[PDB]
Amino acid sequence: MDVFLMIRRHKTTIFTDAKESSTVFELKRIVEGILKRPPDEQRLYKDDQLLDDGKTLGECGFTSQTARPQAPATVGLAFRADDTFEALCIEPFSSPP
Amino acid sequence: MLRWTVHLEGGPRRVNHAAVAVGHRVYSFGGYCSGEDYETLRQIDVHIFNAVSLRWTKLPPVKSAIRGQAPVVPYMRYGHSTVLIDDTVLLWGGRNDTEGACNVLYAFDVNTHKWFTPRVSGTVPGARDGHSACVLGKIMYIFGGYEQQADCFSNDIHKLDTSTMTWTLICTKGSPARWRDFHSATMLGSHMYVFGGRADRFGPFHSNNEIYCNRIRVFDTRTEAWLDCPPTPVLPEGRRSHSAFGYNGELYIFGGYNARLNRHFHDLWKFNPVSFTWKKIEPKGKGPCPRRRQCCCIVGDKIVLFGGTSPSPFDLIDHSDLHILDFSPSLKTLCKLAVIQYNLDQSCLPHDIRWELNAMTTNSNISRPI
Amino acid sequence: MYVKLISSDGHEFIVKREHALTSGTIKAMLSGPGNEVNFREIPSHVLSKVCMYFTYKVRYTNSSTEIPEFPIAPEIALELLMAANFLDC
Amino acid sequence: MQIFVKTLTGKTITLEVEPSDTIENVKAKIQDKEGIPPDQQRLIFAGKQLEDGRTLSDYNIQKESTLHLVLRLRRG
Numbered sequence: 350m351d352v353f354l355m356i357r358r359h360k361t362t363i364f365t366d367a368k369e370s371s372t373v374f375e376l377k378r379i380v381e382g383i384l385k386r387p388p389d390e391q392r393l394y395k396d397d398q399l400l401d402d403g404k405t406l407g408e409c410g411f412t413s414q415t416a417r418p419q420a421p422a423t424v425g426l427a428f429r430a431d432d433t434f435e436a437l438c439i440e441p442f443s444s445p446p
Numbered sequence: 447m448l449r450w451t452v453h454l455e456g457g458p459r460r461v462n463h464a465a466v467a468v469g470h471r472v473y474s475f476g477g478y479c480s481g482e483d484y485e486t487l488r489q490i491d492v493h494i495f496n497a498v499s500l501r502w503t504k505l506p507p508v509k510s511a512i513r514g515q516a517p518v519v520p521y522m523r524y525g526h527s528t529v530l531i532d533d534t535v536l537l538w539g540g541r542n543d544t545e546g547a548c549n550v551l552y553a554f555d556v557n558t559h560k561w562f563t564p565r566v567s568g569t570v571p572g573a574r575d576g577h578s579a580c581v582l583g584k585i586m587y588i589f590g591g592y593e594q595q596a597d598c599f600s601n602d603i604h605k606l607d608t609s610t611m612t613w614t615l616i617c618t619k620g621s622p623a624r625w626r627d628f629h630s631a632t633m634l635g636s637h638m639y640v641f642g643g644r645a646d647r648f649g650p651f652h653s654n655n656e657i658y659c660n661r662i663r664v665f666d667t668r669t670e671a672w673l674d675c676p677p678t679p680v681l682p683e684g685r686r687s688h689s690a691f692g693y694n695g696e697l698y699i700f701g702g703y704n705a706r707l708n709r710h711f712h713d714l715w716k717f718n719p720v721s722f723t724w725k726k727i728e729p730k731g732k733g734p735c736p737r738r739r740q741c742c743c744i745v746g747d748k749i750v751l752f753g754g755t756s757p758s759p760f761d762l763i764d765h766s767d768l769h770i771l772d773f774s775p776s777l778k779t780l781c782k783l784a785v786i787q788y789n790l791d792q793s794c795l796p797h798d799i800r801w802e803l804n805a806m807t808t809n810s811n812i813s814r815p816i
Numbered sequence: 817m818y819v820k821l822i823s824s825d826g827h828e829f830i831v832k833r834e835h836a837l838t839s840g841t842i843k844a845m846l847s848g849p850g851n852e853v854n855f856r857e858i859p860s861h862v863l864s865k866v867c868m869y870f871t872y873k874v875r876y877t878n879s880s881t882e883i884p885e886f887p888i889a890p891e892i893a894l895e896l897l898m899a900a901n902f903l904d905c
Numbered sequence: 906m907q908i909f910v911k912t913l914t915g916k917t918i919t920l921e922v923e924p925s926d927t928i929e930n931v932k933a934k935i936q937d938k939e940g941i942p943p944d945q946q947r948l949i950f951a952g953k954q955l956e957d958g959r960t961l962s963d964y965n966i967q968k969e970s971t972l973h974l975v976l977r978l979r980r981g
Contacts, residue, residue, distance in 0.1 A: 364831045418871035442860040445891040461980045478979045653952040654973045687981035705913045739981025755980040777869045781897035788890040
């Protein structure tokens with residue numbers, strides 16, 4: 350049912366949930382209302398796989414069993430730069446001692 | 447989600463005691479313990495568990511108010527009941543081995559710690575042990591137990607109206623719950639939910655037909671009627687000496703003992719009165735060992751569980767330990783548990799956290815191991 | 817609706833405001849006199865875990881179905897405890 | 906002759922007795938053999954509670970028969 354996500358770009362990390370049945374485009378519109386960039390200026394990735402606007406999250410592989418609130422699944426985000434898109438780049442979190 | 451978060455030793459070693467929560471402190475009264483004296487004239491006992499500092503204390507003996515008068519305090523007993531109404535514990539019922547059972551109402555002020563015996567009127571219930579007591583407003587409801595004089599299980603409801611200190615034997619409507627003792631009765635809204643207990647499958651007398659109830663029974667206090675209620679497809683095993691408490695509108699029962707199976711329990715069942723359904727709950731963490739006739743009290747989102755009897759690794763032991771079940775553990779609680787579990791160095795931590803870590807890991811000194 | 821929690825090492829965490837309210841400290845900070853919060857002392861690997869705890873707490877409150885525990889690695893437990901204590905959560 | 910007393914949990918206690926012995930006598934012998942005071946004892950045979958005054962032959966308890974022992978639930 351519900352997938353719990355981290356949408357990550359550079360040093361930005363969005364925590365949000367969605368339905369398995371909701372679409373990548375719906376995911377892009379959540380990003381749009383937060384980061385003020387429209388869907389046509391966003392690329393979303395599951396690891397290295399670019400995600401299509403019209404696939405549902407479940408169709409992309411996100412399952413509630415693997416996107417739990419205490420272990421959210423990661424979604425990469427890349428923005429359009431000028432005529433081309435920036436490379437997908439996620440800055441790692443710091444590390445414990 | 448819910449978890450056993452504290453396990454502490456060195457409390458009072460008691461079973462068949464009675465306890466209420468006053469704020470964040472639990473008051474425990476009386477109870478039995480093997481090898482200790484339940485024949486001679488002893489005053490009943492009050493131990494207080496502080497659920498913030500996680501310390502047990504004990505109140506000093508009651509002194510005579512005036513020279514020549516005896517101290518006002520119930521004699522040491524077990525199988526009694528205690529309820530809290532405003533600033534007053536009402537203690538009733540129970541027995542010791544010598545004087546048997548008495549039916550004098552005892553009142554205990556939780557702030558001054560003075561006992562008194564308010565004058566009552568009406569039809570006083572006969573002395574008994576193993577009854578249930580619960581309250582709604584100023585009314586205390588006594589149900590069941592084993593009557594000492596009649597020598598029988600009871601299925602009466604006696605209500606004490608503490609506004610006038612008047613007992614009424616309630617002429618109920620509907621099919622009353624079966625005569626029984628060491629059951630529980632829990633108020634959810636205006637309805638009294640009666641679960642478990644030892645009983646006889648034919649009547650109100652011992653006859654070598656002992657049974658362990660599990661068809662929950664519901665008493666509406668507004669209409670003073672026993673209700674007919676839908677079947678429960680799933681239900682806990684029959685038992686006696688479980689603990690019962692209502693939390694967030696639902697009934698919970700812990701532990702207990704079934705003599706037909708000769709089995710002690712440490713399970714946790716939730717009953718939802720609205721769906722009228724049962725559900726076995728699995729808390730995180732290692733709980734208490736299977737045991738009976740412990741006491742359970744609610745402190746915010748936590749249950750303080752302590753005391754009771756269980757088989758010894760026929761060979762029973764009484765418990766001085768105490769458990770806390772936390773329905774909604776904070777992240778700070780989960781992290782203290784991790785720091786303890788992984789045995790990490792605590793000397794980096796700020797002193798407020800260290801005080802907490804210490805509190806949940808230090809025994810009290812009411813008792814020593816046997 | 818969302819708020820931004822910035823860690824010491826400069827990571828930005830954007831979480832539902834209702835989730836962040838799980839922290840009494842953040843609750844206080846968002847209601848200060850006269851929206852985002854800068855935590856100069858909490859690094860990103862700790863603060864990310866705190867946000868996951870927010871999500872877990874709100875999702876599983878008043879829930880009785882069996883669920884996984886909130887995992888706390890030993891290498892993070894001391895810092896996480898200090899963070900939870902500072903954040904009152 | 907001999908009789909047995911069994912609680913619900915078990916633990917047979919075979920006792921040497923004669924039909925003339927009262928139910929108070931059998932409670933006495935039980936205390937000798939198990940350390941249970943007679944006031945916490947309740948003996949039941951054929952679903953009837955045995956009075957402390959009547960003897961064994963008054964309730965038709967012949968050789969090899971078992972009485973049921975019910976105790977005060979001091980520990981619940």
